[PDB]
Structure formats: structure tokens, C-alpha cells
Ligand binder design. Structure first.
Ligand code: NAG
Ligand code: NAG
Ligand code: NAG
Ligand code: NAG
Ligand code: NAG
Ligand code: NAG
Ligand code: ZN
Lengths: 98, 596
């Protein structure tokens, strides 16, 4: 029952979910000074995801009423954008393993 | 499918990318400031160039969305920030020559040096030697020589450059939607689209005029007292009816009168409150100074500090081989990284500075949730105002006795309070007429009201009529006196300090009323008052999302800046000044001049 970018566009648990959510910090291992851009999250999707769904399709988001014609730029943005994880980051943006 | 829906996604993408790029620029700056080397200089330059390129690209992208089609009043503010057009709207050559003028002015001010005539034995820069002479020396002839020498060295060089600068900035403003560069600067306070809370660019002029008209009696009495003391110091150089001379004010420009405290202290027998020896005898250091400040900010209700903050922040100067800038600064690197860069020593001044910087960081933490374009203070004055209110709250004898720096067996008298209020008056009240006068002259020059052939004549006439300060040697149009100041040379907004001076006292009045304080406002401590912390947090969490009028309403219950907090703060000192100057002619006449 949570509303938010990750909840609706990356991984949605069901309303009647029965399970355990285990999270522990991974800043000691998965943070690099240069910026670990490997990990990515989705911030533009056409609609909300159905519960327990995985969407790996990455095509040019069509925010504009003009056809993107397969390219990006004006009103056409990449669906994925990465976290940049660095050890100096404070709590609230450090990478957590769930 | 609509303008608003399209704008939302673009703003989200820009905020996310700007977070990372601003973090790498800020981290490069922090590394360079802490540890100066060629590699760090290159890294900072590269990060800054990348950030500037990103800002330009996104600004050019964002012009597509008209602002008439956006009706969220937050996306509108973000789009206005993006479309502010920091990239030059003028020609390439015009932008290049504007940058050339700015760089030349900055270089001239920074590298300005004065030597003896036909004598290279001594050559003094501004900060190391000239400022020291102005602050400490009591020689009238030396002070006049230094003042005239600086003016002749800098203003003669900077006059035509500043004329070209004002023409170019007026052209830039006309190219944008503003009238003049004064209008551009006044636009920082402009709030449109919110009925019942709007602020107009023209309203700032009237508000500042009315506030100064209210301040005038207290400043007149302060000027009379300082003039009497300086007459006692220099016998015949000050007239009982004449304005105070410029070079004797304490600093090269007269912005602050704090250097006059030693000469014009009311009661010298009882020393002012000092805790340096006590801190040494109780074995205190910078780490525990910051720990005590953290405890204070917890007690008021603000959140605790971060373990990452404690680990990464360098609160002590490494020294030795390492060289770093020692100007205290609080860094909001972003994404949870909050740091302080301060070569802290064991002084009461450094304790207050640490409180000021931690107030900065608490504000930065408070507005962290808001988007990147809104992660700032509501206007240019609230941020330093929040620093200063904590600075004043943490300097009270009650707080010092509670923390234990002072002996609890002590009791305070009338002379100590009067001396402290007069010192704070020379620090605070003195800079208000100067700031008002400088900003008014700069606005008039931008608007073209003051012609080129009368720039300095009108400047000195307005200074004599407003601040009651007259030049020792009359200056014709060749000199350019205002260009000597750093803010005027580097083109920084200067009414920020006037606004901050009013805002800090309004905040203090509101928080003292919240904290259930009985007594005069100067002896106000908000240490263990939880209600005051929440009342301040109601504004601290907003950031720039809401108008500064609404933020001021949330804190003090008034939608407009008020000076009655300052008047109530200085009421006891005003009574003392009325008692002292009862036999002295309060005010000044424009006729008198040092030159005859
Ligand atoms: C747009 O308006 C909605 C009101 O439903 C608000 O929640 C949202 O925060 C606004 N957009 C931004 C970027 O603040
Ligand atoms: C910014 O400059 C561009 C240059 O083409 C112009 O089209 C735009 O109207 C300007 N925006 C503002 C707010 O002045
Ligand atoms: C968090 O605040 C508590 C008091 O509210 C304090 O004891 C603790 O040390 C703080 N945490 C850190 C990491 O400073
Ligand atoms: C500054 O940084 C460089 C590179 O990280 C390092 O080698 C050096 O020890 C640091 N300090 C000084 C004083 O150069
Ligand atoms: C209050 O201050 C005045 C300063 O004029 C002083 O003369 C008087 O003695 C003070 N009162 C007390 C009780 O010390
Ligand atoms: C504020 O609270 C602290 C912690 O309980 C206490 O030591 C201090 O005495 C209090 N302040 C005053 C003025 O009593
Ligand atoms: Zn400050």
C-alpha cells in the first residue's frame, strides 16, 4: 500500500503481501569513490505496474505529443537513470541491500 | 499530453541529473579548499565546467514550456529558475567584454597596493596592512593619507570600467524582461501569482525607505554619541554640528563601526564577558565546542548531527605541510553530505562562529527534502539570519553559566549590559544606513537617474544627508569611491545585509515570545524551549517552495519586514543614549566640511 516512484515503477508488492522484507546497509562494499553507476532505477513509465511484475523494456519515453521517432532529446527521455553511490554519502542516499 | 505533464517529467530528470553533477562540483570544491594542489585545481575547474555546460543545456531546453500554461505555483518557480537565462542573451562579443570588465575590476581590487611616493621601500596591500592601519592606528594624518591613497589607486582605474559596466548591465536587463540591473536584483524579492501574499519589485523600495525612516532616531542618537566620543579623542577635527569624517569611522569604507569600540566604550572598568581563559582552564577544544553546539541545537528541537558529518568534517586546521583557507564556511555538498570548514581555535568568537555554521547546516538539513532548484533560503537574507539568531542566542550570560564556562556565583550589572548592547549597536545599527545608501545609489545609477557628470557629487550629497558622513578631501568626478568596496567591485547584491538585519531581530522576537521569556530581549536564551524550535522549523523545512512573505508569516505572524524588533532590542541602549546625549546636539548639518 505504499505510493512512490520505486513502488509504482520498479517493484510493487501486493496489498495482501505475506513475506519478510530484510534490509541491511551495503555502503561498506557496494560504494565506490568514482561513482557506482551500475545500479539503475526506472523513473518514467506509461502506467503503474501490476503487483509482482518485472519490466526490463527500455525504449525512448514519449512525453511529447510529437512522435519521438525513436530518438531522444526534446520531450523524449531515457527511461532509466542510475544511482551514483559514493562512500562519502550520508544516510538516506547510501546503498541498502534488500 | 499537456504542457504541465510534459514539464513535470523534464523537471524530475533535470533535478536528478543536477543532484549528481552539483555533488561532484561541490566535492571538487571541498577537496581543493581543504588541500590545495594543482591536481585539485584541475579537478575543480573540470567539475565546474561540466556543471556550467549542463546548466546551459538544460536552460536552453526548458525555454520550450511557456509559463502562462503552468498552474502549479511550484513547477512555475522551478521553470522560472531554469529560464532565468544565466547564459548571456547578448552577443558573444558583448558577453566577452562584460566578462573582461568583471575580471579586470576583480583583479584591480584584489591586487591593489599602495607604496610611498617615489619610494619602493614599503608597498601595502589592502587586507594585510591597509586594513590593519585603518582598524588600529589613531593618527589623523595617516588615516587621511591611507584613505586618499586607496581611493586614488582604485577609483581612478575603476571609473570608466564601471561606467561601461553599468551601460552593459542595463542593456542586459533590457534584453531580458527587467528594466535595469537594479530591477534584476530587486526581482529576488518579487512574488507574483499568489494573491494575498504577493510581493512586487517596486514594493522593496518603499519598504526599505519606511524601515530606514523608522530607524532614523536611534541612528541619530548613536551618531551623536560616537561623534562626542570622537571629539574627545581628536580635539578640533570634529565639529559639534558637523558630520562624522569618513576615514575615522574604523574601516576603509565605514561599513562597520566595531573598531571604534575601544575608543568609545562607555564603562571600561568592568571588562566585557570573556570565556577564553575559562575554556583553557576547563580544558576545552574545538571538537567539544562543536559537541556543545550540537547539544544546544538538539535542546532547541532541531535534529542531531550525522556520523558522516562528524567523520568527514574537518573542524581543526591540519597545519604543517597542509595549507587550507581558514574562512569559516558550512558546505551542503548534497545527498546527505553536510560539512564545516573552519580553522577553529579556543575563542568565544570561534564558539559563536561554530554556532553560526551549525545553524547554516541545520537550515540545509531542513530544506533537504525539497527539489534541487528549491534547496535554498526563501530569500537572500533568511539563511544568514538563521545563523545570526543562533549566534545571539548562544552568547547570553545565562547560557554561558548553564554550560558552565562562567562561574555560577557571578551576577550581572547595568554597565556590562550597556557595554554589550553598545558593541552590538556599533556592529549592527551602523551598517544599516551605509547599506541603504549604497544600494540606493547603485539602483539610481542603474536606472540612470544620476548622470555620469554627477555620479560622485550625488553620492556624497546622499551620504551626507543619510549616513552623516563627509569626505575629508573633496573628490571631483575623476574618483569613483563606491568601486573601492568588494561587493561593488565584484557586483554582488548588497541589500541582503539590510534584510538580514531586520529578519534576525524579527525571528528573535518571535522565538523569545514563543519561549515564554520575561525581560529585555537581549537577555534571551532559547536553549531548552522546544516550542521555539518547531516554530522555526515550520519555516526551515519550506525552503523556496513558499514565498518569503508566507515564511515570515509562519515565523513571526507578519507578512512584511518590521523594524520594531530592532527598536525593542535596542530600547535600553536607546534610554542610555538619551541620558548621555541630553546635552549634545543630535543630528548633523550638511554645510560643514573638513576642507576649508
Ligand atoms: C504539483 O501539484 C501537486 C498538487 O496535487 C503537488 O502535489 C506537486 O508537488 C506539484 N509539483 C511539484 C513539482 O511540486
Ligand atoms: C532567454 O534567451 C532566449 C534566447 O533565444 C530567449 O528566446 C528567451 O525568451 C529568454 N528568456 C527570458 C526569460 O528572457
Ligand atoms: C542523535 O541525537 C541524540 C539525542 O537526540 C544523540 O544522543 C545522538 O548522539 C545523536 N546521534 C549522532 C550520530 O550524533
Ligand atoms: C592532497 O591530496 C593529494 C592527492 O590526494 C595527496 O597526495 C596529498 O598528500 C594531500 N595533501 C597535500 C598537503 O598535498
Ligand atoms: C543602572 O545603570 C546606571 C547607568 O547610568 C547606573 O548609574 C546605576 O547605578 C545602575 N543601577 C544599579 C543598581 O547598578
Ligand atoms: C537546559 O537543559 C539542560 C539539560 O537538562 C540543563 O542542564 C540546563 O540547566 C537547562 N538550562 C537551564 C537554564 O536550566
Ligand atoms: Zn551565516
Amino acid at each position: 500500500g505504499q505510493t512512490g516512484n520505486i513502488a509504482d515503477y520498479n517493484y510493487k508488492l501486493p496489498d495482501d503481501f505475506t513475506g519478510c522484507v530484510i534490509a541491511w546497509n551495503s555502503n561498506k562494499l557496494d560504494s565506490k569513490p568514482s561513482g557506482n553507476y551500475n545500479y539503475r532505477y526506472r523513473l518514467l513509465r506509461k502506467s503503474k505496474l501490476k503487483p509482482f511484475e518485472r519490466d526490463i523494456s527500455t525504449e525512448i519515453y514519449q512525453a511529447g505529443n510529437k512522435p519521438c521517432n525513436g530518438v531522444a532529446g526534446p520531450n523524449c527521455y531515457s527511461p532509466l537513470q542510475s544511482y551514483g553511490f559514493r562512500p562519502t554519502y550520508g544516510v538516506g542516499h547510501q546503498p541498502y541491500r534488500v | 499530453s499537456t504542457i504541465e505533464e510534459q514539464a513535470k517529467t523534464f523537471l524530475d530528470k533535470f533535478n536528478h541529473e543536477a543532484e549528481d553533477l552539483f555533488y561532484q562540483s561541490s566535492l571538487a570544491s571541498w577537496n581543493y579548499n581543504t588541500n590545495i594542489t594543482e591536481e585539485n585545481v584541475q579537478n575543480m575547474n573540470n567539475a565546474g565546467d561540466k556543471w556550467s555546460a549542463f546548466l546551459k543545456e538544460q536552460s536552453t531546453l526548458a525555454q520550450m514550456y511557456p509559463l502562462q500554461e503552468i498552474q502549479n505555483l511550484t513547477v512555475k518557480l522551478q521553470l522560472q529558475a531554469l529560464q532565468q537565462n544565466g547564459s548571456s542573451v547578448l552577443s558573444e562579443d558583448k558577453s566577452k567584454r562584460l566578462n573582461t570588465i568583471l575580471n579586470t575590476m576583480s583583479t584591480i581590487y584584489s591586487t591593489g597596493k599602495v607604496c610611498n611616493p617615489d619610494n619602493p621601500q614599503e608597498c601595502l596591500l589592502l587586507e594585510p596592512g591597509l586594513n590593519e592601519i585603518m582598524a588600529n592606528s589613531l593618527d589623523y594624518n595617516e588615516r587621511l593619507w591611507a584613505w586618499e591613497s586607496w581611493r586614488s589607486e582604485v577609483g581612478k582605474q575603476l571609473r570608466p570600467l564601471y561606467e561601461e559596466y553599468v551601460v552593459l548591465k542595463n542593456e542586459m536587463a533590457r534584453a531580458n524582461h527587467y528594466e535595469d540591473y537594479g530591477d534584476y536584483w530587486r526581482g529576488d524579492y518579487e512574488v507574483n501569482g499568489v494573491d494575498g501574499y504577493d510581493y512586487s519589485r517596486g514594493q522593496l523600495i518603499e519598504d526599505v525607505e519606511h524601515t530606514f525612516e523608522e530607524i532614523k532616531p536611534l541612528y541619530e542618537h548613536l551618531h551623536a554619541y560616537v561623534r562626542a566620543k570622537l571629539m574627545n579623542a581628536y580635539p578640533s577635527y570634529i565639529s559639534p554640528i558637523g558630520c562624522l569624517p569618513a576615514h575615522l569611522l574604523g574601516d576603509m569604507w565605514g561599513r562597520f563601526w566595531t573598531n571604534l569600540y575601544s575608543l568609545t566604550v562607555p564603562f571600561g572598568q568592568k571588562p566585557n564577558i570573556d570565556v577564553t581563559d575559562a575554556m583553557v582552564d576547563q580544558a576545552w577544544d574545538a571538537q567539544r565546542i562543536f559537541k556543545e553546539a550540537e547539544k544546544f541545537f538538539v535542546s532547541v528541537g532541531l535534529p542531531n548531527m550525522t556520523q558522516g558529518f562528524w567523520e568527514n568534517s574537518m573542524l581543526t586546521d591540519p597545519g604543517n605541510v597542509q595549507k587550507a583557507v581558514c574562512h569559516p564556511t558550512a558546505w551542503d555538498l548534497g545527498k546527505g553530505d553536510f560539512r564545516i570548514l573552519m580553522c577553529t581555535k579556543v575563542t568565544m568568537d570561534d564558539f559563536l562562529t561554530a554556532h553560526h555554521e551549525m545553524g547554516h547546516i541545520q537550515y540545509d538539513m531542513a530544506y533537504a527534502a525539497q527539489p534541487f532548484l528549491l534547496r535554498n533560503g526563501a530569500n537572500e537574507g533568511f539563511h544568514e539570519a538563521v545563523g545570526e539568531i543562533m549566534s545571539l542566542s548562544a552568547a547570553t550570560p545565562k547560557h554561558l553559566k548553564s554550560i558552565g564556562l562562567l562561574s555560577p556565583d557571578f551576577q550581572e550589572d547595568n554597565e556590562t549590559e550597556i557595554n554589550f548592547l553598545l558593541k552590538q549597536a556599533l556592529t549592527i545599527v551602523g551598517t544599516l544606513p551605509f547599506t541603504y545608501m549604497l544600494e540606493k545609489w547603485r539602483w539610481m545609477v542603474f536606472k540612470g537617474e544620476i548622470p555620469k557628470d554627477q555620479w560622485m557629487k550625488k553620492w556624497w550629497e546622499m551620504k551626507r544627508e543619510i549616513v552623516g558622513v563627509v569626505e575629508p578631501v573633496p573628490h571631483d568626478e575623476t574618483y569613483c569611491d563606491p568601486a573601492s568596496l568588494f561587493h561593488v567591485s565584484n557586483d554582488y547584491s548588497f541589500i541582503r545585509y539590510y534584510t538580514r538585519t531586520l529578519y534576525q531581530f524579527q525571528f528573535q522576537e518571535a522565538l523569545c515570545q514563543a519561549a515564554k521569556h520575561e525581560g529585555p530581549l537581549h537577555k534571551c536564551d532559547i536553549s531548552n524551549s522546544t516550542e521555539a524550535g518547531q516554530k522555526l522549523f515550520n519555516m526551515l523545512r519550506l525552503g523556496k517552495s513558499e514565498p518569503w512573505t508566507l515564511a515570515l508569516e509562519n515565523v513571526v505572524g507578519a507578512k512584511n519586514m518590521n523594524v520594531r524588533p530592532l527598536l525593542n532590542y535596542f530600547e535600553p541602549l536607546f534610554t542610555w543614549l538619551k541620558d548621555q546625549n541630553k546635552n549634545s546636539f543630535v543630528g548633523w548639518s550638511t554645510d560643514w566640511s573638513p576642507y576649508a
